[PDB]
PDB file of C-alpha atoms (C1' of nucleotides) in Angstrom:
ATOM      1  CA  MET A  26      19.304-139.287  97.082  1.00 40.26           C
ATOM      2  CA  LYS A  27      21.164-136.082  96.141  1.00 40.44           C
ATOM      3  CA  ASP A  28      21.956-132.760  97.519  1.00 40.88           C
ATOM      4  CA  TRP A  29      23.733-130.221  95.293  1.00 41.35           C
ATOM      5  CA  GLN A  30      21.739-127.194  96.173  1.00 41.42           C
ATOM      6  CA  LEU A  31      23.355-125.832  99.309  1.00 40.66           C
ATOM      7  CA  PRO A  32      27.347-124.998  98.646  1.00 43.99           C
ATOM      8  CA  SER A  33      29.630-123.474 101.231  1.00 44.56           C
ATOM      9  CA  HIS A  34      32.056-121.556  98.861  1.00 46.48           C
ATOM     10  CA  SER A  35      35.548-120.406  99.677  1.00 45.82           C
ATOM     11  CA  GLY A  36      35.962-116.870  99.565  1.00 47.75           C
ATOM     12  CA  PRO A  37      36.976-115.556  96.141  1.00 46.38           C
ATOM     13  CA  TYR A  38      37.952-119.368  95.204  1.00 42.48           C
ATOM     14  CA  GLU A  39      35.686-122.203  94.316  1.00 40.18           C
ATOM     15  CA  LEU A  40      36.692-126.049  94.161  1.00 40.44           C
ATOM     16  CA  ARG A  41      33.982-127.784  92.293  1.00 42.07           C
ATOM     17  CA  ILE A  42      33.394-131.138  90.263  1.00 45.44           C
ATOM     18  CA  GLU A  43      32.703-130.572  86.513  1.00 47.36           C
ATOM     19  CA  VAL A  44      31.175-133.509  84.526  1.00 47.85           C
ATOM     20  CA  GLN A  45      29.377-135.663  87.313  1.00 51.52           C
ATOM     21  CA  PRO A  46      28.865-139.442  86.701  1.00 50.71           C
ATOM     22  CA  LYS A  47      25.943-141.428  87.578  1.00 51.29           C
ATOM     23  CA  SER A  48      24.847-142.884  91.157  1.00 52.79           C
ATOM     24  CA  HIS A  49      24.762-146.337  89.540  1.00 52.86           C
ATOM     25  CA  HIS A  50      28.291-147.465  89.425  1.00 51.09           C
ATOM     26  CA  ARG A  51      29.018-151.056  88.757  1.00 47.35           C
ATOM     27  CA  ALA A  52      31.111-152.791  91.396  1.00 47.59           C
ATOM     28  CA  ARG A  53      32.034-156.290  90.586  1.00 47.76           C
ATOM     29  CA  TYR A  54      33.352-159.020  93.136  1.00 48.28           C
ATOM     30  CA  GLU A  55      36.753-160.274  94.022  1.00 48.04           C
ATOM     31  CA  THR A  56      35.621-163.727  92.709  1.00 48.57           C
ATOM     32  CA  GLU A  57      34.406-162.279  89.276  1.00 52.63           C
ATOM     33  CA  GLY A  58      37.028-159.521  88.945  1.00 57.58           C
ATOM     34  CA  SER A  59      36.792-158.547  85.103  1.00 56.37           C
ATOM     35  CA  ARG A  60      34.314-155.655  84.424  1.00 59.46           C
ATOM     36  CA  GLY A  61      32.865-152.675  86.663  1.00 62.43           C
ATOM     37  CA  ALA A  62      34.825-149.213  86.900  1.00 61.35           C
ATOM     38  CA  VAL A  63      34.301-145.486  86.377  1.00 63.08           C
ATOM     39  CA  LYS A  64      31.503-145.074  84.008  1.00 59.81           C
ATOM     40  CA  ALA A  65      27.855-143.751  83.801  1.00 57.93           C
ATOM     41  CA  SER A  66      24.512-145.014  82.420  1.00 60.81           C
ATOM     42  CA  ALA A  67      25.763-143.653  78.981  1.00 60.60           C
ATOM     43  CA  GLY A  68      28.808-141.496  79.183  1.00 59.20           C
ATOM     44  CA  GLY A  69      29.801-138.888  81.828  1.00 57.60           C
ATOM     45  CA  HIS A  70      33.126-139.476  83.751  1.00 54.35           C
ATOM     46  CA  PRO A  71      33.744-137.676  86.889  1.00 51.23           C
ATOM     47  CA  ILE A  72      35.941-134.371  86.786  1.00 52.38           C
ATOM     48  CA  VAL A  73      37.592-132.233  89.417  1.00 56.25           C
ATOM     49  CA  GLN A  74      38.680-128.755  88.611  1.00 54.62           C
ATOM     50  CA  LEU A  75      39.529-125.998  91.120  1.00 54.84           C
ATOM     51  CA  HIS A  76      38.567-122.350  90.138  1.00 56.21           C
ATOM     52  CA  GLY A  77      39.843-120.005  92.641  1.00 55.93           C
ATOM     53  CA  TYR A  78      43.527-120.362  93.664  1.00 61.25           C
ATOM     54  CA  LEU A  79      45.147-118.233  90.880  1.00 63.77           C
ATOM     55  CA  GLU A  80      48.537-117.704  92.519  1.00 61.29           C
ATOM     56  CA  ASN A  81      51.925-118.948  91.285  1.00 63.56           C
ATOM     57  CA  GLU A  82      52.007-121.339  94.197  1.00 62.83           C
ATOM     58  CA  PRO A  83      51.267-125.171  93.651  1.00 63.51           C
ATOM     59  CA  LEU A  84      48.270-127.208  95.425  1.00 64.26           C
ATOM     60  CA  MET A  85      47.620-130.597  96.677  1.00 62.24           C
ATOM     61  CA  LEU A  86      44.005-131.934  96.512  1.00 63.96           C
ATOM     62  CA  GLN A  87      43.012-135.021  98.645  1.00 63.55           C
ATOM     63  CA  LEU A  88      39.980-137.428  98.388  1.00 60.95           C
ATOM     64  CA  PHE A  89      38.101-138.681 101.445  1.00 63.28           C
ATOM     65  CA  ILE A  90      35.849-141.672 101.020  1.00 60.52           C
ATOM     66  CA  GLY A  91      33.188-142.355 103.622  1.00 60.91           C
ATOM     67  CA  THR A  92      30.042-144.778 103.161  1.00 64.40           C
ATOM     68  CA  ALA A  93      26.538-143.296 102.700  1.00 66.30           C
ATOM     69  CA  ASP A  94      25.456-143.041 106.406  1.00 61.57           C
ATOM     70  CA  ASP A  95      23.030-140.788 108.032  1.00 62.95           C
ATOM     71  CA  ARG A  96      24.720-137.815 110.196  1.00 62.66           C
ATOM     72  CA  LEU A  97      28.108-138.903 111.227  1.00 65.81           C
ATOM     73  CA  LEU A  98      30.025-140.923 108.530  1.00 71.19           C
ATOM     74  CA  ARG A  99      31.570-144.379 109.048  1.00 71.73           C
ATOM     75  CA  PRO A 100      34.694-146.009 108.090  1.00 72.50           C
ATOM     76  CA  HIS A 101      34.904-146.894 104.552  1.00 74.80           C
ATOM     77  CA  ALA A 102      34.200-150.408 103.697  1.00 73.03           C
ATOM     78  CA  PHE A 103      36.462-151.868 101.102  1.00 75.96           C
ATOM     79  CA  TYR A 104      35.828-149.966  97.614  1.00 71.53           C
ATOM     80  CA  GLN A 105      39.451-150.153  96.551  1.00 71.23           C
ATOM     81  CA  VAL A 106      40.692-151.515  93.185  1.00 73.09           C
ATOM     82  CA  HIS A 107      42.914-150.547  90.244  1.00 75.80           C
ATOM     83  CA  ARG A 108      41.979-150.239  86.314  1.00 77.63           C
ATOM     84  CA  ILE A 109      43.161-150.798  82.858  1.00 73.16           C
ATOM     85  CA  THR A 110      42.261-149.032  79.620  1.00 72.45           C
ATOM     86  CA  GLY A 111      44.267-146.696  77.279  1.00 75.10           C
ATOM     87  CA  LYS A 112      41.463-144.201  78.036  1.00 74.45           C
ATOM     88  CA  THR A 113      42.754-144.335  81.679  1.00 73.70           C
ATOM     89  CA  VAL A 114      44.277-140.425  81.395  1.00 74.56           C
ATOM     90  CA  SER A 115      46.073-140.895  84.788  1.00 74.72           C
ATOM     91  CA  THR A 116      47.367-137.152  84.348  1.00 73.95           C
ATOM     92  CA  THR A 117      46.461-136.540  88.232  1.00 73.79           C
ATOM     93  CA  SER A 118      45.492-139.496  90.118  1.00 80.62           C
ATOM     94  CA  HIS A 119      46.844-141.346  93.434  1.00 75.31           C
ATOM     95  CA  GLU A 120      45.482-143.867  96.122  1.00 73.47           C
ATOM     96  CA  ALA A 121      46.196-144.109  99.751  1.00 75.84           C
ATOM     97  CA  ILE A 122      44.788-147.121 101.814  1.00 74.66           C
ATOM     98  CA  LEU A 123      43.963-146.092 105.633  1.00 73.16           C
ATOM     99  CA  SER A 124      42.789-147.992 108.701  1.00 69.88           C
ATOM    100  CA  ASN A 125      39.263-148.943 107.080  1.00 67.83           C
ATOM    101  CA  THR A 126      39.183-145.977 105.007  1.00 66.04           C
ATOM    102  CA  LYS A 127      40.366-145.087 101.340  1.00 63.49           C
ATOM    103  CA  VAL A 128      41.749-141.876 100.231  1.00 63.34           C
ATOM    104  CA  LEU A 129      43.354-140.374  97.067  1.00 64.57           C
ATOM    105  CA  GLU A 130      46.168-137.748  97.430  1.00 65.66           C
ATOM    106  CA  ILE A 131      46.014-135.872  93.940  1.00 66.25           C
ATOM    107  CA  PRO A 132      48.170-133.097  93.706  1.00 68.21           C
ATOM    108  CA  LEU A 133      47.673-130.238  91.195  1.00 71.42           C
ATOM    109  CA  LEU A 134      50.458-128.719  88.815  1.00 71.63           C
ATOM    110  CA  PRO A 135      51.128-125.153  88.437  1.00 72.53           C
ATOM    111  CA  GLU A 136      49.924-123.779  85.117  1.00 74.62           C
ATOM    112  CA  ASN A 137      48.015-126.894  84.016  1.00 75.30           C
ATOM    113  CA  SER A 138      44.534-125.171  83.858  1.00 74.95           C
ATOM    114  CA  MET A 139      44.010-126.859  87.419  1.00 75.44           C
ATOM    115  CA  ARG A 140      42.765-129.909  85.530  1.00 75.08           C
ATOM    116  CA  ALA A 141      41.886-133.216  87.324  1.00 76.40           C
ATOM    117  CA  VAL A 142      39.796-135.790  85.095  1.00 78.39           C
ATOM    118  CA  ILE A 143      38.800-139.229  86.676  1.00 81.41           C
ATOM    119  CA  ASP A 144      38.815-141.855  84.306  1.00 79.83           C
ATOM    120  CA  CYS A 145      41.234-144.425  85.908  1.00 80.69           C
ATOM    121  CA  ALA A 146      39.576-145.700  88.974  1.00 78.65           C
ATOM    122  CA  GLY A 147      37.226-148.865  88.951  1.00 73.14           C
ATOM    123  CA  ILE A 148      34.703-150.009  91.566  1.00 75.29           C
ATOM    124  CA  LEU A 149      34.675-153.193  93.504  1.00 79.87           C
ATOM    125  CA  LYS A 150      31.470-154.605  95.429  1.00 77.64           C
ATOM    126  CA  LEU A 151      32.105-155.294  99.033  1.00 80.70           C
ATOM    127  CA  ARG A 152      30.453-158.820  99.551  1.00 78.42           C
ATOM    128  CA  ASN A 153      28.122-157.829 102.502  1.00 82.55           C
ATOM    129  CA  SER A 154      28.081-161.485 103.717  1.00 86.08           C
ATOM    130  CA  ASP A 155      31.955-161.092 103.983  1.00 84.52           C
ATOM    131  CA  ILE A 156      31.314-157.730 105.905  1.00 87.03           C
ATOM    132  CA  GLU A 157      28.842-159.545 108.159  1.00 84.28           C
ATOM    133  CA  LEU A 158      31.153-161.861 109.750  1.00 82.83           C
ATOM    134  CA  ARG A 159      33.425-158.714 110.339  1.00 83.66           C
ATOM    135  CA  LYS A 160      31.886-157.872 113.615  1.00 83.70           C
ATOM    136  CA  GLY A 161      32.397-154.811 115.761  1.00 86.06           C
ATOM    137  CA  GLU A 162      32.932-152.724 112.573  1.00 88.42           C
ATOM    138  CA  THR A 163      29.789-151.098 110.954  1.00 87.03           C
ATOM    139  CA  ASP A 164      31.071-151.122 107.422  1.00 86.82           C
ATOM    140  CA  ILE A 165      28.814-152.201 104.425  1.00 81.53           C
ATOM    141  CA  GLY A 166      27.351-155.133 106.597  1.00 80.23           C
ATOM    142  CA  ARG A 167      24.204-156.345 104.883  1.00 79.40           C
ATOM    143  CA  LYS A 168      21.629-153.269 104.752  1.00 81.59           C
ATOM    144  CA  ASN A 169      23.958-150.651 103.541  1.00 82.97           C
ATOM    145  CA  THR A 170      25.131-151.306  99.815  1.00 82.06           C
ATOM    146  CA  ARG A 171      26.002-147.387  99.459  1.00 85.50           C
ATOM    147  CA  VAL A 172      29.082-145.425  99.969  1.00 85.13           C
ATOM    148  CA  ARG A 173      29.743-141.619  99.605  1.00 86.23           C
ATOM    149  CA  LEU A 174      32.581-139.515  98.325  1.00 87.91           C
ATOM    150  CA  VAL A 175      34.045-136.487 100.133  1.00 86.93           C
ATOM    151  CA  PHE A 176      36.701-134.193  98.349  1.00 90.91           C
ATOM    152  CA  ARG A 177      38.900-132.057 100.473  1.00 92.40           C
ATOM    153  CA  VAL A 178      41.768-129.649  99.429  1.00 92.23           C
ATOM    154  CA  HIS A 179      44.157-127.708 101.581  1.00 92.72           C
ATOM    155  CA  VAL A 180      46.104-124.864 100.360  1.00 90.82           C
ATOM    156  CA  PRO A 181      47.909-122.533 102.766  1.00 89.53           C
ATOM    157  CA  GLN A 182      47.866-118.880 101.846  1.00 92.21           C
ATOM    158  CA  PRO A 183      51.257-117.134 102.459  1.00 91.67           C
ATOM    159  CA  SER A 184      49.885-114.136 104.269  1.00 91.27           C
ATOM    160  CA  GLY A 185      47.635-115.324 107.202  1.00 90.75           C
ATOM    161  CA  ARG A 186      44.584-117.597 106.177  1.00 89.03           C
ATOM    162  CA  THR A 187      44.284-121.431 104.846  1.00 88.51           C
ATOM    163  CA  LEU A 188      42.168-122.351 101.911  1.00 89.33           C
ATOM    164  CA  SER A 189      40.601-125.787 102.637  1.00 89.59           C
ATOM    165  CA  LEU A 190      37.564-127.102 100.671  1.00 92.23           C
ATOM    166  CA  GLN A 191      35.150-130.039 101.374  1.00 89.16           C
ATOM    167  CA  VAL A 192      32.805-131.291  98.498  1.00 93.61           C
ATOM    168  CA  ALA A 193      30.499-134.340  98.385  1.00 91.44           C
ATOM    169  CA  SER A 194      29.964-136.460  95.322  1.00 92.25           C
ATOM    170  CA  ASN A 195      26.861-138.688  94.846  1.00 91.71           C
ATOM    171  CA  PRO A 196      26.708-142.092  96.611  1.00 93.07           C
ATOM    172  CA  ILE A 197      27.762-145.084  94.803  1.00 94.91           C
ATOM    173  CA  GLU A 198      25.126-147.773  94.778  1.00 91.50           C
ATOM    174  CA  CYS A 199      25.443-151.188  93.342  1.00 94.25           C
ATOM    175  CA  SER A 200      22.260-152.801  94.634  1.00 95.16           C
ATOM    176  CA  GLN A 201      19.300-152.380  92.134  1.00 95.30           C
ATOM    177  CA  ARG A 202      16.386-153.374  94.249  1.00 93.07           C
ATOM    178  CA  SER A 203      15.059-150.445  96.399  1.00 95.26           C
TER     179      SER A 203
ATOM    180  C1'  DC B  13      33.888-154.557  76.362  1.00 95.48           C
ATOM    181  C1'  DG B  14      31.065-153.071  79.665  1.00 95.18           C
ATOM    182  C1'  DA B  15      26.885-152.771  81.873  1.00 95.81           C
ATOM    183  C1'  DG B  16      22.687-153.942  83.279  1.00 97.20           C
ATOM    184  C1'  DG B  17      19.102-157.356  84.423  1.00100.52           C
ATOM    185  C1'  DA B  18      18.155-161.320  86.112  1.00 99.33           C
ATOM    186  C1'  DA B  19      18.814-165.256  89.122  1.00 99.95           C
ATOM    187  C1'  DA B  20      19.963-167.163  92.746  1.00 99.58           C
ATOM    188  C1'  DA B  21      22.048-168.327  97.832  1.00 97.28           C
ATOM    189  C1'  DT B  22      22.372-167.161 102.118  1.00 96.58           C
ATOM    190  C1'  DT B  23      21.277-164.704 106.302  1.00 93.04           C
ATOM    191  C1'  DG B  24      18.897-162.481 109.308  1.00 91.85           C
TER     192       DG B  24
ATOM    193  C1'  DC C  10       9.738-166.331 105.521  1.00 94.02           C
ATOM    194  C1'  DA C  11      11.418-162.918 103.874  1.00 91.04           C
ATOM    195  C1'  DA C  12      15.299-159.990 103.538  1.00 90.91           C
ATOM    196  C1'  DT C  13      19.239-159.273 101.221  1.00 91.35           C
ATOM    197  C1'  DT C  14      22.548-160.605  99.092  1.00 91.61           C
ATOM    198  C1'  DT C  15      25.333-162.849  95.726  1.00 93.44           C
ATOM    199  C1'  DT C  16      27.098-164.054  90.757  1.00 92.96           C
ATOM    200  C1'  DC C  17      25.820-165.002  86.952  1.00 92.84           C
ATOM    201  C1'  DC C  18      23.728-164.025  82.702  1.00 93.16           C
ATOM    202  C1'  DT C  19      22.591-161.560  79.048  1.00 98.65           C
ATOM    203  C1'  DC C  20      22.464-157.338  77.001  1.00 96.98           C
ATOM    204  C1'  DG C  21      23.843-152.658  74.855  1.00 94.92           C
TER     205       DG C  21
END
DNA sequence: CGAGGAAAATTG
DNA sequence: CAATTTTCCTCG
């Protein structure tokens, strides 16, 4: 259900998420698109801050979404939707649709305290029945209503070594019945 | 306003 | 048949 006790670290640098949301996101449907977005049982929007690269060179962070499978990940289902609310502090946020995969290329400014708060992305539920007739693909069919987040950064050091990171956020789950 | 809970439909 | 889902409803 959660594995936050076994980090890999990146030398003298460390890219980790600050305030973490709950694993019970509320993804609505394309037929009832109205509510459902970035929130938690009470209050705890997700935050992403890098504490390591302290050079005058800029950096670009990318997001990699992958369903909550067992060992090898699968091609993301369809958790792709926009948002709307003055509280949508889009200081650092971006999206990138891929062949059955969703990614977010969020760049980091130079001296902006390396801040990247997440409060401008909602969540849509993937109608399993619609993904059942999909055939071939192994996206959210009918027994997998859970996806996983994988944050990855890539900052090349001007000397002889690349600084790449890979974090894993909690799996998004809309089904309430175990 | 959002979210959760419950209800329900359909599919396997 | 039960599994699982689906969408709604109600509620905070």
